Amino acid sequence: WEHRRFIVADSRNFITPEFPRDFWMSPVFNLPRETAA
Amino acid sequence: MDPYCPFDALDVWEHRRFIVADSRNFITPEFPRDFWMSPVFNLPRETAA
């Protein structure tokens, strides 16, 4: 045998991360068509 | 910061032969979580510009 606790993977299991306010104004999510790279 | 779960947890006895409903468990390591550091991506000293 084996004994363990057990948490069911139901599709109602969500997760809520928190973003900073100036997160999406980052120089990688906003790239021009022609960079120096 | 806890993930929402409706179900608290359950007690499951499993004889090794009679395994049915083959789902998979989530593997976590054996060292404690204080060693599992935050990710650091070092910026280069120079810029592409």
């Binding site: - | 409706p6 179900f7 359950l10 007690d11």
Partner: protein, 126 residues
Amino acid sequence: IRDLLNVLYYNGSRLSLLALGPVNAELRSLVLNMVYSITEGTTIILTLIPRLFALSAQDGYVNALLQMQSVTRERRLPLYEALVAWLTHAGQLGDTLALAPVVRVCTFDGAAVVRSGDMAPVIRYP
């Protein structure tokens, strides 16, 4: 209980139960025990746990039921003077309404299906 369905299918042979005049009245004491013992039961457990209907029908109620299944997790109302008395009555109807069978028919030298009016052979549990 509708007064305050008669189609039966056995052997692929249709039955009917309706054909009601005195049969409604003759069975009335059977009805009044069947209603009450249920409605007493579904209020005391509703009093012991006041949350069996107010939980969400598929989030919380399944959360509570699964913990009930697991073994290894551990003026005045006349409340506990009813759990005694409700199990006297519900413990009684379990005898007369289970209808424990006495007879098994094992056919031998004859028809497999016994028709209405035949003489069928009879064995009891040994």
